[PDB]
Design a protein around this ligand. Structure first.
Ligand SMILES: c1nc(NC2CCCCC2)c2nc[nH]c2n1
Length: 337
C-alpha cells in the first residue's frame, strides 16, 4: 500500500509516508500510535540471499546490543508470527531529519559545526571500536542528523568483528587497503573513511571521487603522492602492488592548497587520518585527543562498550535457512507478547 509494494506494519503504525529506498529497500515514515510520535521504518526482504541474511542479522544484533547517543538504535521489529510466514522484516527507528550527504549538498558548514560533527562521529566510533567492531562502511549518507544537530551512525549490515566484492553505493570512502583487496585490515579503515568525511565537510565535495576502480587509486595518489614499498605492506596482489609501484611519481599536495580556508588544526588531523600506511594512521582515541577537538574531548564523558562484541557463533558459514532461524529468534522479543 505504498509505491505499489506491501508495507504491513499496522495497526500500531499508521499514516505511512514514502521517504526513499535502501540499502535494504523501502524506507517509510509512519505514525506510532502507541508512542504518539512519527518513526522511520525500514522494510527488509533478505531471506533468499545468504549475504542479505548475514547483513540483516548483523544489523539487528549489533544495534540491539549497542547503546550510545551517537549510534542509531532499534525501537521495534515487525515480522510474521510464524517463521514460515516470515518473508519480510520491518525495522523501526527514531525518525531523523536528514543525513550528512544531503546536508553537504545544500549547506556550508561553519568551522565550529565541522568540529562538532567530527567529534560526534569519532565519539560514536570510539564506542564501536571498543566493542571490537569495524563499521567498514562509514560515509556521509550513513551519518544521520536530527533537528538539533545530533549525529547518529547508521547501517551496521557490513560490520564485522575485528579478528567484499558486493555492490556498495559508493567506494569514495574506502581505505587503499580495502580497494586493493587486502586480507587482514584493521580498525584503521574506519579512520580513513572519517578523514574522507572530514575533507568533504571542509569543501562540500568528495576528496577522492574516482570514476572507476583504478581511477579511485589515481585520485588518492594524486593528492597523497606515490606510496612507498613500506606503505604497501598489506597482503595484496603481487601484480597490483607492482603496477601501483610503477605509476608515475606524484608529489604530496599540501593540505592548505586544497583547503585554503580550513582551520590549520583540522588539516593537521586530516593529515593523520588520510595516511596511506594503515600502521601510520591515527587511532580513534588519538584522533579524539587531537588539539582540533580539544573543546569537546572528555574521556569521562565518552562511553565504551561494556564488553567486546562477540558473535558467539560465526555468521558467514551458516546456510541462509539457519540464518533465518537466528533472525526469527533475535526478533521474538518484540512480538506480542
Ligand atoms: C533513512 N532515512 C531516514 N530519514 C531520512 C529523511 C529524509 C532525509 C534523509 C533521512 C531515517 N530516519 C531514521 N532512520 C532513517 N533511515
Amino acid at each position: 500500500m505504498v509505491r505499489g509494494q506491501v508495507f504491513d506494519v499496522g495497526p500500531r503504525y499508521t499514516n505511512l509516508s514514502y521517504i526513499g529506498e535502501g540499502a535494504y529497500g523501502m524506507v517509510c515514515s509512519a505514525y506510532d500510535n502507541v508512542n504518539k510520535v512519527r518513526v522511520a521504518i525500514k522494510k527488509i526482504s533478505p531471506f533468499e540471499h545468504q549475504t542479505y541474511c548475514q547483513r540483516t542479522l548483523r544489523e539487528i544484533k549489533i544495534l540491539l546490543r549497542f547503546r550510545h547517543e551517537n549510534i542509531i538504535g532499534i525501537n521495534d521489529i515487525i515480522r510474521a508470527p510464524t517463521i514460515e510466514q516470515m518473508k519480510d522484516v520491518y525495522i523501526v527507528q527514531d525518525l531523523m531529519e536528514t543525513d550528512l550527504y544531503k546536508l553537504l549538498k545544500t549547506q556550508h558548514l561553519s568551522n565550529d559545526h565541522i568540529c562538532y560533527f567530527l567529534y560526534q562521529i569519532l565519539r560514536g566510533l570510539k564506542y564501536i571500536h571498543s566493542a571490537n567492531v569495524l563499521h567498514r562502511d562509514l560515509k556521509p549518507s550513513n551519518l544521520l542528523l536530527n533537528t538539533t544537530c545530533d549525529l547518529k551512525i547508521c547501517d551496521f549490515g557490513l560490520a564485522r568483528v575485528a579478528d567484499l566484492t558486493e555492490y556498495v553505493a559508493t567506494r569514495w570512502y574506502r581505505a587503499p587497503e580495502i580497494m586493493l583487496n587486502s586480507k587482514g585490515y584493521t580498525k584503521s579503515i574506519d579512520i580513513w573513511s572519517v578523514g574522507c568525511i572530514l575533507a568533504e565537510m571542509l569543501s562540500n565535495r568528495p576528496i577522492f571521487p574516482g570514476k572507476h576502480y583504478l581511477d579511485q587509486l589515481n585520485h588518492i595518489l594524486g593528492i597523497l603522492g606515490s606510496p612507498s614499498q613500506e606503505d604497501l605492506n598489506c597482503i595484496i596482489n603481487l601484480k597490483a602492488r607492482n603496477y601501483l609501484l610503477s605509476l608515475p611519481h606524484k608529489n604530496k599536495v599540501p593540505w592548505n592548497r586544497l583547503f585554503p580556508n580550513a582551520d590549520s588544526k583540522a588539516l593537521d588531523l586530516l593529515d593523520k587520518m588520510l595516511t596511506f600506511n594503515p600502521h601510520k594512521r591515527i587511532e580513534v582515541e588519538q584522533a579524539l585527543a587531537h588539539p582540533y577537538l580539544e573543546q569537546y574531548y572528555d574521556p569521562s564523558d565518552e562511553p565504551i562498550a561494556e564488553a567486546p562484541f562477540k558473535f558467539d557463533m560465526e555468521l558467514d558459514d551458516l546456510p541462509k535457512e539457519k540464518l533465518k532461524e537466528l533472525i526469527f529468534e533475535e526478533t521474538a522479543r518484540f512480538q506480542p507478547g
